[PDB]
Design an enzyme around this catalytic site. Sequence first.
Site, PDB file in Angstrom:
ATOM      1  N   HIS A 252       4.502   0.338 -13.769  1.00 30.27           N
ATOM      2  CA  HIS A 252       4.888   0.189 -15.168  1.00 30.27           C
ATOM      3  C   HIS A 252       6.274   0.768 -15.409  1.00 30.27           C
ATOM      4  CE1 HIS A 252       3.436   4.433 -15.817  1.00 30.27           C
ATOM      5  NE2 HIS A 252       4.385   4.421 -16.735  1.00 30.27           N
TER       6      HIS A 252
ATOM      7  N   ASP B 137      -1.243   0.480 -10.487  1.00 32.41           N
ATOM      8  CA  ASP B 137       0.027   0.906 -11.071  1.00 32.41           C
ATOM      9  C   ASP B 137       0.911   1.574 -10.021  1.00 32.41           C
ATOM     10  OD1 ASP B 137       1.875   1.093 -13.093  1.00 32.41           O
ATOM     11  OD2 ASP B 137       1.107   2.973 -13.925  1.00 32.41           O
TER      12      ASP B 137
END
EC number: 3.4.22.-
Length: 188
Positions: free
Chosen positions: A68, A92
């Site tokens: 992210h 992530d």
Amino acid sequence: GSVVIVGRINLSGDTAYAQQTRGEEGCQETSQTGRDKNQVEGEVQIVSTATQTFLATSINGVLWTVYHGAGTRTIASPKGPVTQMYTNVDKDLVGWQAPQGSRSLTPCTCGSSDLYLVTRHADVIPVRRRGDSRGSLLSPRPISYLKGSSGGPLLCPAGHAVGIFRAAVCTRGVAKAVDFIPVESLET
Ligand SMILES: C=C[C@@H]1C[C@]1(NC(=O)[C@@H]1C[C@@H](Oc2nccc3cc(OC)ccc23)CN1C(=O)[C@@H](NC(=O)OC(C)(C)C)C(C)(C)C)C(=O)NS(=O)(=O)C1CC1
Ligand SMILES: [Zn+2]
């Protein structure tokens, strides 16, 4: 554009400190060309794109950070932009081969539950581990102070890597705990 190293968090002494190695314009120029010849050192890098800044941590010979933050972007290097060697968007997690000059933190073998979160501001915050991927903040902080610190390491008392800071647990508008990617998941 590429992710660019713009600084580091030095962990060599008893007191952590941040060092800036590039400014705003240098970051943007280097992101566009993907060509970065600056000397690398240390375990924790401060990294940036044109629009986001966060942290990256070398463990197991790989420079890891959060998806992210980095998306699927290349990282700028002495030889031009380099593609990610690891990409798991759901965890992530992304990673590139660690830059020459970097040092990796050793994965923790202590099983210690006394952790320390290293932030981009070089604040090393006491954290009590609760589960495989969670620990409680033992000193109060706002979400806003922790922002920009994803990708930074959770350390044990011995300075070993326990995990990578992924998300904050926000309760009643403040940071109560941290969610992190366990080092056990940073397999090469
Ligand atoms: C205060 C600082 C936190 C560390 C920090 N990370 C965040 O902001 C993260 C980003 C987003 O989460 C996630 N995205 C994508 C996949 C995820 C997969 C997951 O797991 C596979 C779990 C979370 C995930 C929302 N979020 C939260 O932390 C959110 N928390 C959150 O989602 O908490 C949960 C996970 C407990 C629900 C929050 C606090 C915004 C509400 C940061 O500094 N970022 S950064 O500014 O550097 C920025 C790169 C430029
Ligand atoms: Zn340890």
